[model samples]
Target: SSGRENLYFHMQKVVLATGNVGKVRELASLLSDFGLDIVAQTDLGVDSAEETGLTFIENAILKARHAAKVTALPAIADDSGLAVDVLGGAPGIYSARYSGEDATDQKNLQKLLETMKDVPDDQRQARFHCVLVYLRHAEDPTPLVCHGSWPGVITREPAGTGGFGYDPIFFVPSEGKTAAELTREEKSAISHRGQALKLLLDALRNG
Candidate 1:
């Protein structure tokens, strides 16, 4: 493809600066061809971290730098969230805990549905945002940061059997189905995570 694709991510050691095992697994699978060593915070027995940053880029950089400092290794970290235009991005940073403490996908989705029940379908437009931070070293002056956006609307009802988080309610206009409704490869074709990963790969080679 003529699009930005990284065929040469020549880093020797790569670490996913996150506590989420699932995120580590997903990233490892996508970036496995690099032959770079991939490690997660949990793998080193680090406790949970608070994403106190005000923006996705800030949070991602914080995490990546933290991990890079800890292991003195190159690190990549990501922060993603769902943003609703009508809600004024109410769930942007709070996407993980939309429904309150001990947030679960089911509970969050339910809460979203209830909150938007009275609103018109046309006003339910939303998108997913992802930011990736690439740090070569902890004390580096400036690390590379990239961003991606995925357009979709919230479904009237959640559906499908694939993906997690708000996937079930994330209606993909291109596919005419919710993210949860798509197959793994299909979903990856246009997912925010996938888009950001692609950009990161490109940055690794050219940026």
Candidate 2:
């Protein structure tokens, strides 16, 4: 049986193809209800494989396969970024380095704010997109894939103090606040990553 399907029987370990500690914690919390143990690639001395894919879905699969190939275990991966309507979905795959190579969140956010400084509120529409992939092995022919999006508008300035990346500048219309204003629990309940995880969780439960 495939590694993911076999989860119905007993607990097992899976490598996560990401070095982001915050993401690791978030994913771990979401997957806690399942009978799987999530291990960060860094914990196993694994280096990141080059992210050369043109899209989130492709990158997710690439990362998952890289980890599975190295550890010989089922692997999971996620690729997410902020996309702005006015910017032609710019910073989509380049969201991390929108400012430049080795750019920090604050720098990337600053760059975005400056570029959109004159953009009217109505034209500031944007969204966060995430893609999740689960590979049973390095060469899994039918990897499970999921995608999600959280729509919002870009604020003129930063707001709140929670979350990371572009959260401070991402205005959540429904909440009347920025993404950073939402608590971890609240954010998880409506986040792109959370939405994608729900699909995987449902599949596991039904299987």
Candidate 3:
């Protein structure tokens, strides 16, 4: 049992290492059935880590390891970004810092739109990719990583104002709506982050 103690008194605590409130909330809910105590970085006062990794997996591992070392707690970290087919994943890991330093969702979205406006609708295919990292305190912390992907296309214009990142134009064709259009609970049920975290949890429970 990763986070279990005694049979009746299973005191468990895990650090969700993320500054994004939306992402942390979703992860907390997903791990609820484990009956373990959840602590988000916002609640624990953990600051953001520098993401200098070249790939999603590398970035996730870096974040998780950093959190586990900084807080001395079992931690989970994730790095999610949008990959536009037409742009050859131009904004893959740089999605958050796309426009410039301290980039906002609006600026990132607007930049994406300006770059791809000349692109044809048929070539607007894109997807959101997410990678989750799990780290435990030990002599050698080898971070475990898993991935999830959601298929969609970038819209010509932004849509709903529900989600924070590039969710406005990231249309989930299967749902006939963008990620922003879906409620927290609804999106958590089928989102890329949700799917990836689900797989990680299942592995942890089974192993």
Count of clashes, each model:
0, 0, 0
lDDT by residue for model 2 (1-207), tens: 224442636667888898878778866776766777788998888899899988889999999999999998888999999999999998899999899978999999999999999998789999999999888889889888878899999999999889999999999999999999999999999999888888777766664
Tell me the tens digit of each residue's lDDT in model 3 across 29-117. Answer: 76666654567766777777888998888888777777767777777888889999878887999999899987999999999999999
Superposing all C-alpha atoms, what RMSD in Å does each candidate have to the true structure? 3.9, 2.5, 3.4
For candidate 1, write residues 1-207 as lDDT tens digits. 212222333546677877677778887876777666677876876555578987788888888878877777777888899999999886888889899999999999889888888879788899999998777777766777779889999988989979889999989888889999999898788888888988877766553
Best by TM-score: 2
- Ranking of predictions according to lDDT: 2, 1, 3
Pairs clashing in candidate 1?
none
Q: Distance from true position, residue 196, model 2, in Å?
A: 1.5
Quick one: best lDDT, which candidate?
Answer: 2
lDDT of each: 0.80, 0.88, 0.78
lDDT of 3: 0.78
lDDT of 1 at 40: 85
Q: After superposition, how far is residue 35 of candidate 3 from its true place, in Å?
A: 5.4
Which portions of model 3 miss their true places by more than 4 Å?
1-9, 19-29, 32-35, 42-45, 138-141
